[PDB]
């Protein structure tokens, strides 16, 4: 990617094979899950849009996700073009106009244009906008890939509650909702689907009982 | 490969053994597919033709494809000789002569004159031309290695729609054609060969429907 | 992370993929043993809070501990806000205003603000405060995953005392108490939960004898 | 090995353990197959004869091939000594006489002699000559280690043409001869040694057809 | 850890995760054997006491050894305090006072103190003193870990003397004594406790015989 | 290891963990064989005697050979002291006397003395003499570790000559003798210790020939 030098200006270098190998292996070994959402960002810091597309294209299988994210990239490019109108007229020497909807995706822009835009004054966060579009695509794809809702989780008749609440929280994180909805469901849903003994213990604890007391009470 | 020093100049370096080892192992462990096209292009960036042919020759197995791509390289060299005029006569000293069909293939050009071509003014991107020739050859090879065509795709009575659309897009990527016909196919063909229930569902959906709505409605 | 340049000044850098991959794999592989507490501080030194969040969010499963640490971070931020009054008024550039309960966690602060805080004179160890909050969260996670207390370990009738003392100290390091109580318990329980021959040797040695002489004399 | 210095004087460079480990593992792993010929030339670029000897002696087992290559090295060193005229006259400081048959092999010559020969103007390609000698030795070793001829390959009546052509080209590369004979055999034996149906298909296709045409026609 | 920069002053460096992982795995997997003592000095050259403490506390299991090492570190800190009286008075400008007993252990001193001490003129090798204390702890823990002494080892009549002399040397090197005492042991006990046939053969050969002729004397 | 800066001075550095780990692993998994002798010489270029002794002491098991090589080092140091003139009395400023018997072994001389000797004018190849002493010790060790002699090997009735000549050369390489007798014995008994059919075939081929013909005739 484009990273700083030792007390020098920003310079471009090829993507390290280790990074892309780790990305593709963690994509293939682990299914689409929320934990891959931040990891990708940690692997895409200061990366040009061309490098992002190169990393994206190496994914093998699950082409439906690729088509979904390409469609979302196209629609976001159209939104950016219509909200930020395409200015007309010649550009002064030493300057280039703002990247278009096709330019951010890298389909109609070369690496030299990306380098010029990234280091331009004022800076052009085209790569950051492409990264956030990819983040939105990943959010909707992990919404798609989640096979179960949050209202159909019930603890077993004698199943330990540890992994039950663990998977409940795991499914809750993959749910696209609001903060207050999450608070309500973590206040009410978990107690309505528990084993009778420690669920009545929780009902005795009353509202506001944090998970530490609830887990120390449901012991055994 | 040719690499730039930190705030320095362009210098040649030997190929790291890990890069070629990863290339050969990913070639031998993964069957030929379009996703190997970016993987090859992300590793051979800024590489002399000598490195390109050493990486190409180290591949073990499927040597019929190697012979086919060598034949296409030879025919592309002939095309370059026949369309780009051959500058007859001895060029004046101080300027590197026009690369031949063998020179671009690396079969007769040593590393010293390759570096001279790299540092010539104006720069001569012979390595990029050879890389694009290799890309075309690999496209022909992956076209050859396509297990089946695209018009015979049919969703089984018990086949899930997810796997059906995944393999449909896999074969669509495996198809070599223009973007317009790709759009026409992805807009018309997939709905024709689906299961009757989802066929009627998509017919009720009508035209101008994104694939996310189709896949959400086809569930069950 | 924040790495000092070669005979230069401190410059910001992103977390290497190898370090985060090793951290996540070592966290997910075996268990939430107390030994993760030192190794964490061996991988998150001089790191901005957002990179701490990125390393935190990559954990696979075990979301109950994640909720625990998030709630403890929120309550500690509230305590920090209530104990330290907000400094209002105009703020000079280069030295930004006091961070809030959301700025310390980095959920609202950006990279530039964190860099400014790091380079601010007087120094702002907000990253260190977040790290020590994470240390407390890890301590209570170890408490959550502690199999049992120390008050029930009894040496076997024929079990060698080596494994007994080893597991006693293993449980002791996971205990949450003051140092004086730990010294008292390691002085008392060891002699009160031993085999008859080892305990008679201990009482022959009398009080004030360290474990060295104890387990060199109880040998045989 | 001998590494060029950035606008300075070249100096000896230590051999990385990665190259030795990779070389020994790839040698011990699969076979004395032709694919080791390029790999070796990728792991010994610009290496001193001492480095080549060190790489040679690292192998374990299969000492018969080592004896073969040692005998060939001895005979070709004798040939080089008998063809190259013996240097006569005083040797000025900063220069050295032509390396002996034992010196090119590196058995007796020290690293200082190799450095002096490299820094001599014009440089003596002793390393390149020894490398091509090793290449010839490996070629004849692979010739010995091929347990099949080119004229004995038969295609089963229901055997696909794919693996037939694959093995045909494997044996073609395993066989060493003039290029014209290789072209003649790959043009004649391919059609002449196939199943009757595809044989008549190729006869209908006519002579000089590219292998892509025949492989597409023989399908079915 | 602490590494001098090329053409520059010494600068603090973060701990390599691979080094820590290799250290912890080699400590946990093989044994508490003497050969790990030199390896420690290979992985602890030029490091702050905090680095040594982090390396020590990351080990899993064998917590009795860790407690013993901590107690010996405390007693050596007390010894350092008693040998070097606590100098009172104002701190010299730019010259921090010598580390205390708790300062060498690093439990009460921030990293900046060690950073200043390492680069201070004259240099203060407090880290080397801590390393030597750890070496003494390793010596005593490997002494107590040895299950058998050297005065009771006996050779069975139904096995070759190879493994007997091997284990004799294992026990000899596992015990800490003067060099002359070790020479006397390897001169007397190697022949005073052998099999009778080999004992008589060596008595016939006479004293002052090397181990090579000793082992080649009674083979089988 | 101590290394020379490009167009600069000679700076001492610590041994990389990779080299030591590879050395100990290859020692463990590849129990003493001739091919390990070059390996050490590939992993000890430009290394101080302290580094050599450190990597020597890290070995685990087979301490009888370690004591043998230690004794040979001591006796070679005594020989060096008794042969090379030992100088005493005043020492010229800016220079130090040559290393003694204890200094070359590294038992008494400090690392700074080795650093000064390596950079001295003229340089002192004490490290290389210690390396060649270790080479001689390893040669005698591998001579000791020979499973059997070289004149007793035979070929089984159902044993192909391939692995027969392989083991013959493997055992022959483990012989420390002159090259002339090696050539004499490898030309006569290599057929006298084989199966009668190929024996008579080789005898009919003529007394003595190139081994390639003798192995091609013996094929099958």
């Amino acid at each position: 990617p484009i990273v700083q030098n030792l007390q020098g200006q920003m310079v471009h270098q090829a993507i390290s094979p280790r990074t892309l190998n780790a990305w593709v292996k963690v994509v293939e070994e682990k299914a689409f899950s929320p934990e891959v959402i931040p990891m990708f960002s940690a692997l895409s810091e200061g990366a040009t849009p061309q490098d992002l597309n190169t990393m994206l294209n190496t994914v093998g299988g699950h082409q439906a996700a690729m088509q979904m994210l390409k469609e979302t990239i196209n629609e976001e490019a159209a939104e950016w073009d219509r909200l930020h109108p395409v200015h007309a007229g010649p550009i002064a020497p030493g300057q280039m106009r703002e990247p278009r909807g096709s330019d951010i995706a890298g389909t109609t822009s070369t690496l030299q244009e990306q380098i010029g835009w990234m280091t331009h004054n004022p800076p052009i966060p085209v790569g950051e906008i492409y990264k956030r579009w990819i983040i939105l695509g990943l959010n909707k794809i992990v919404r798609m890939y989640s096979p179960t809702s949050i209202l159909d989780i019930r603890q077993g008749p004698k199943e330990p509650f540890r992994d039950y609440v663990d998977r409940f929280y795991k499914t809750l994180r993959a749910e696209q909702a609001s903060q207050e909805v999450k608070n309500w469901m973590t206040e009410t849903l978990l107690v309505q689907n528990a084993n009778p003994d420690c669920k009545t213990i929780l009902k005795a604890l009353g509202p506001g009982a944090t998970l530490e007391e609830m887990m120390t009470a449901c012991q055994g | 490969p040719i690499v730039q020093n930190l705030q320095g100049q362009m210098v040649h370096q030997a190929i790291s053994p890990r890069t070629l080892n990863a290339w050969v192992k990913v070639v031998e462990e993964k069957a030929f597919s379009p996703e190997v096209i970016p993987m090859f292009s992300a590793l051979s960036e800024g590489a002399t033709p000598q490195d390109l042919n050493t990486m190409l020759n180290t591949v073990g197995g499927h040597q019929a494809a190697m012979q086919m791509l060598k034949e296409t390289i030879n025919e592309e060299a002939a095309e370059w000789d026949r369309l780009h005029p051959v500058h007859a006569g001895p060029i004046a000293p101080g300027q590197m002569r026009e690369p031949r069909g063998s020179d671009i293939a690396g079969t007769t050009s040593t590393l010293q004159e390759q570096i001279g071509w790299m540092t010539h003014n104006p720069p001569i991107p012979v390595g990029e031309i050879y890389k694009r020739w290799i890309i075309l050859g690999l496209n022909k090879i992956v076209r050859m290695y396509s297990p089946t065509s695209i018009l015979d795709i049919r969703q089984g009575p018990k086949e899930p729609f997810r796997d059906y659309v995944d393999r449909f897009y896999k074969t669509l990527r495996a198809e070599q054609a223009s973007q317009e016909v790709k759009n026409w196919m992805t807009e018309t063909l997939l709905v024709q060969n689906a299961n009757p229930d989802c066929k009627t569902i998509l017919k009720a959906l009508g035209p101008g429907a994104t694939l996310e709505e189709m896949m959400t409605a086809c569930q069950g | 992370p924040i790495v000092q340049n070669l005979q230069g000044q401190m410059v910001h850098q992103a977390i290497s993929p190898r370090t985060l991959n090793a951290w996540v794999k070592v966290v997910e592989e075996k268990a939430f043993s107390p030994e993760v507490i030192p190794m964490f501080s061996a991988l998150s030194e001089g790191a901005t809070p957002q990179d701490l969040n990125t390393m935190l969010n990559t954990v696979g499963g075990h979301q109950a501990a994640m909720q625990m640490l998030k709630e403890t971070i929120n309550e500690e931020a509230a305590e920090w806000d209530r104990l330290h009054p907000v400094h209002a008024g105009p703020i000079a550039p280069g030295q930004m205003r006091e961070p809030r309960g959301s700025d310390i966690a980095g959920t609202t602060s950006t990279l530039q603000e964190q860099i400014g805080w790091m380079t601010h004179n007087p120094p702002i160890p907000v990253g260190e405060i977040y790290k020590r909050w994470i240390i407390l969260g890890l301590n209570k996670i170890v408490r959550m995953y502690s199999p049992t207390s120390i008050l029930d370990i009894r040496q076997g009738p024929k079990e060698p005392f080596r494994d007994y003392v080893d597991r006693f100290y293993k449980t002791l390091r996971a205990e949450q108490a003051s140092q004086e109580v730990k010294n008292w318990m390691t002085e008392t329980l060891l002699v009160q939960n031993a085999n008859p021959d080892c305990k008679t040797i201990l009482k022959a040695l009398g009080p004030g004898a360290t474990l060295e002489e104890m387990m060199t004399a109880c040998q045989g | 090995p001998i590494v060029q210095n950035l606008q300075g004087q070249m100096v000896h460079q230590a051999i990385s353990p990665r190259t030795l480990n990779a070389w020994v593992k790839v040698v011990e792993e699969k076979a004395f197959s032709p694919e080791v010929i390029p790999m070796f030339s990728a792991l010994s670029e610009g290496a001193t004869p001492q480095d080549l000897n060190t790489m040679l002696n690292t192998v374990g087992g299969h000492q018969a091939a080592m004896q073969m290559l040692k005998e060939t090295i001895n005979e070709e060193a004798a040939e080089w000594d008998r063809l190259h005229p013996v240097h006569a006259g005083p040797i000025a400081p900063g220069q050295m006489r032509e390396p002996r048959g034992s010196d090119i092999a590196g058995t007796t010559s020290t690293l200082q002699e190799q450095i002096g020969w490299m820094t001599h103007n014009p440089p003596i390609p002793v390393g390149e000559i020894y490398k091509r000698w090793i290449i010839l030795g490996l070629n004849k070793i692979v010739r010995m280690y091929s347990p099949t001829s080119i004229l004995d390959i038969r295609q089963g009546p229901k055997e696909p043409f794919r693996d037939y052509v694959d093995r045909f080209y494997k044996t073609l590369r395993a066989e060493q001869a003039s290029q014209e004979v290789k072209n003649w055999m790959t043009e004649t034996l391919l059609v002449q040694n196939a199943n009757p149906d595809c044989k008549t298909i190729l006869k209908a296709l006519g002579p000089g057809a590219t292998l892509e045409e025949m492989m597409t026609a023989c399908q079915g | 850890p602490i590494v001098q920069n090329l053409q520059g002053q010494m600068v603090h460096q973060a701990i390599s995760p691979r080094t820590l992982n290799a250290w912890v795995k080699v400590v946990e997997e093989k044994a508490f054997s003497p050969e790990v003592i030199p390896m420690f000095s290979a992985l602890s050259e030029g490091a702050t006491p905090q680095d040594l403490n982090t390396m020590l506390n990351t080990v899993g299991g064998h917590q009795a050894a860790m407690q013993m090492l901590k107690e010996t570190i405390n007693e050596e800190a007390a010894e350092w305090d008693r040998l070097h009286p606590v100098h009172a008075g104002p701190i010299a400008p730019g010259q921090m006072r010598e580390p205390r007993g708790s300062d060498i252990a690093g439990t009460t001193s921030t990293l900046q103190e060690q950073i200043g001490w390492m680069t201070h003129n004259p240099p203060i090798p407090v880290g080397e003193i801590y390393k030597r204390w750890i070496i003494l702890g390793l010596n005593k823990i490997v002494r107590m870990y040895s299950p058998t002494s050297i005065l009771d080892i006996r050779q069975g009549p139904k096995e070759p003397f190879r493994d007997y002399v091997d284990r004799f040397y294992k026990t000899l090197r596992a015990e800490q004594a003067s060099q002359e005492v070790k020479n006397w042991m390897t001169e007397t006990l190697l022949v005073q406790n052998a099999n009778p046939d080999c004992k008589t053969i060596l008595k016939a050969l006479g004293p002052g015989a090397t181990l090579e002729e000793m082992m080649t004397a009674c083979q089988g | 290891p101590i290394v020379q800066n490009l167009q600069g001075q000679m700076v001492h550095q610590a041994i990389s963990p990779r080299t030591l780990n590879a050395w100990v692993k290859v020692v463990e998994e590849k129990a003493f064989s001739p091919e390990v002798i070059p390996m050490f010489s590939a992993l000890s270029e430009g290394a101080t005697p302290q580094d050599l002794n450190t990597m020597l002491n890290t070995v685990g098991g087979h301490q009888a050979a370690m004591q043998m090589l230690k004794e040979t080092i001591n006796e070679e140091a005594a020989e060096w002291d008794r042969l090379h003139p030992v100088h005493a009395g005043p020492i010229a400023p800016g220079q130090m006397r040559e290393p003694r018997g204890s200094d070359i072994a590294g038992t008494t001389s400090t690392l700074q003395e080795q650093i000064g000797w390596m950079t001295h004018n003229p340089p002192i190849p004490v490290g290389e003499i210690y390396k060649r002493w270790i080479i001689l010790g390893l040669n005698k060790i591998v001579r000791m570790y020979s499973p059997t002699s070289i004149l007793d090997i035979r070929q089984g009735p159902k044993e192909p000559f391939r692995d027969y000549v392989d083991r013959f050369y493997k055992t022959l390489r483990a012989e420390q003798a002159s090259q002339e007798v090696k050539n004499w014995m490898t030309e006569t008994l290599l057929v006298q210790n084989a199966n009668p059919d190929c024996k008579t075939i080789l005898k009919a081929l003529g007394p003595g020939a190139t081994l390639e013909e003798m192995m091609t005739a013996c094929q099958g």
Binding site: - | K158 | - | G156, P157, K158 | - | -
Partner: protein
């Protein structure tokens, strides 16, 4: 069929075994086993398969054919390595035993036009390569080496090579008792052929059944469901399949329509 369909479905969902295994284990017709196997989303005749091998003894070629389900042996020495004699032996064994598929290995004489014509006339599908059964590869070679062991033992008491070889193969087929069961190879092969005849009688009985659209009612519900494909009728009940589900209903809760 006493609730064995549910057991077979559970066993195929947990193991996905061969249809014949379920048919033999639960005493069911092969049709229900085949339909249960086809119901599996990840899934899609041992008698009558013979294996041929060639060996060299006393400087002469001997061809031996062996069955897979029973291991019955036939062997003959051929004066000269020609495809005509192998074709003759193939047609003779076709005219002596019911052969459906001839499996062999790679061979120049096996790919002759004469043997191809001979097998095309008989309507027997021939192939060579990996054995059809994933197991019992070593059975053929073990039997061949047992025959090779016994021919050398019985050669001294015979005057001709062919007579000795035939006597040895006769002893191996008849006068050599095995392990489990402990009887002749002829007995096991005739039992296999008899069970094949019985299964073909079952097949023709199923062929007697046809479309015969049948409606069904369950648990005396007021509604009538269907149509459902008829599988079998007997013992006062009818077993049918519909929507990849096989169930047995009493006759009083069903109707049959021509």
């Amino acid at each position: 069929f006493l609730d064995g369909i549910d057991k077979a479905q559970e066993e195929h969902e947990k193991y996905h075994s061969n249809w014949r295994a379920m048919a033999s284990d639960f005493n069911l017709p092969p049709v229900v086993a085949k339909e249960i196997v086809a119901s599996c989303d990840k899934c899609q005749c041992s008698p009558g398969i013979w294996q041929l091998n060639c060996t060299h003894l006393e400087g002469k070629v001997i061809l031996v054919a062996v069955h897979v389900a029973s291991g019955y042996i036939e062997a003959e020495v051929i004066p000269a390595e020609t495809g005509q004699e192998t074709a003759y032996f193939l047609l003779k064994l076709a005219g002596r035993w019911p052969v459906k598929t001839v499996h062999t290995n790679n061979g120049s004489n096996f790919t002759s036009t004469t043997v191809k014509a001979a097998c095309w006339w008989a309507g027997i599908k021939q192939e060579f390569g990996i054995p059809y059964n994933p197991q019992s590869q070593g059975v053929i070679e073990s039997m061949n080496k047992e025959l090779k062991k016994i021919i050398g033992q019985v050669r001294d008491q015979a005057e001709h090579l062919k007579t000795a070889v035939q006597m040895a193969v006769f002893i191996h087929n008849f006068k050599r008792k095995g392990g489990i069961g402990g009887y002749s190879a002829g007995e096991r092969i005739v039992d296999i052929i008899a069970t094949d005849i019985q299964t073909k009688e079952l097949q023709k009985q199923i062929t007697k059944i046809q479309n015969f659209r049948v409606y069904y009612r369950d648990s005396r519900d007021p509604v009538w469901k269907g149509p459902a494909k008829l599988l079998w009728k007997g013992e006062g009940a009818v077993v049918i399949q519909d929507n990849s589900d096989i169930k047995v209903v009493p006759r009083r809760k069903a109707k049959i329509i021509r």
